[PDB]
Design a protein around this nucleic acid. Structure first.
Ligand SMILES: *C(=O)c1cnc2ccccc2n1
Ligand SMILES: *C(=O)c1cnc2ccccc2n1
Ligand SMILES: *C(=O)c1cnc2ccccc2n1
Ligand SMILES: *C(=O)c1cnc2ccccc2n1
Ligand SMILES: [Mg+2]
Ligand SMILES: [Mg+2]
Lengths: 8, 8
DNA sequence: ACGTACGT
DNA sequence: ACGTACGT
């Protein structure tokens, strides 16, 4: 759920 | 030389 | 001359 | 329910 490298 | 994850 | 960064 | 981010 977090987006720091994928954002899902 | 750049540091964006290792910085060497 | 190498690896850091998050939760829904 | 998954991967992005740089050059000395
Ligand atoms: C986001 O909160 C989140 C949490 N756990 C995960 C596990 C695997 C892929 C995506 C994820 N996203
Ligand atoms: C993004 O590509 C990415 C990859 N691995 C991680 C690990 C822990 C926190 C954040 C991350 N983001
Ligand atoms: C920094 O400018 C730089 C450039 N190329 C590299 C290759 C391998 C490890 C470290 C590096 N750092
Ligand atoms: C840092 O851990 C890291 C890893 N791979 C990269 C690829 C391209 C640009 C920056 C990067 N930084
Ligand atoms: Mg460490
Ligand atoms: Mg891409």
């Amino acid at each position: 759920x977090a987006x720091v490298x994928a954002x899902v």
